[PDB]
């Protein structure tokens, strides 16, 4: 009884959102899982470093915002920052 968690169903939801009638193979889905894991580890490592530099003991939204700004370029950084900010305000105001 050994499981194996993955982001397959969430990637599938996003795909059905942006392309309602296109599918995806299994190897492309493995590529997408690898991509999500890689970017997650990058952002989390950078935020941990930022928290250590300032002698803080907590990872908050500002650490994630600054890590996003340090990692993504230009268009990507701007739009990701806007998306995350909107998400956090929508979450707290609910």
């Amino acid at each position: 009884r050994s499981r194996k968690e993955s982001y397959s169903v969430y990637v599938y939801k996003v795909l059905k959102q942006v392309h309602p009638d296109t599918g995806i193979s299994s190897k492309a889905m493995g590529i997408m899982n690898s991509f999500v894991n890689d970017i997650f580890e990058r952002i989390a490592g950078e935020a941990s470093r930022l928290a250590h530099y300032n002698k803080r003991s907590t990872i908050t939204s500002r650490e994630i915002q600054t890590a996003v700004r340090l990692l993504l370029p230009g268009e990507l950084a701007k739009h990701a920052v806007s998306e995350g900010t909107k998400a956090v305000t929508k979450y707290t105001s609910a």
């Binding site: 194996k4 493995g30 590529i31 899982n33 690898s34 991509f35 894991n37 890689d38």
Partner: protein
Amino acid sequence: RDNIQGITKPAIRRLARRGGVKRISGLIYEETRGVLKVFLENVIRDAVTYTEHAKRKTVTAMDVVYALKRQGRTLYGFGG
């Protein structure tokens, strides 16, 4: 044990054609064989280190993925 002549000359010429090369000298084949053997032993050393640390005998795909990632050559697709 010339398993390095297993990489034939037409194979190297195919690899060159994919890279956009239009003409190939005759001394290129030995050079690429040397380069490839260097790269391969560099990767396999760390793969076997990762393996024997875990007290296993079978080299797994994740060991190769880690050995590559530590060289700065991340590889997507075998993360399962």
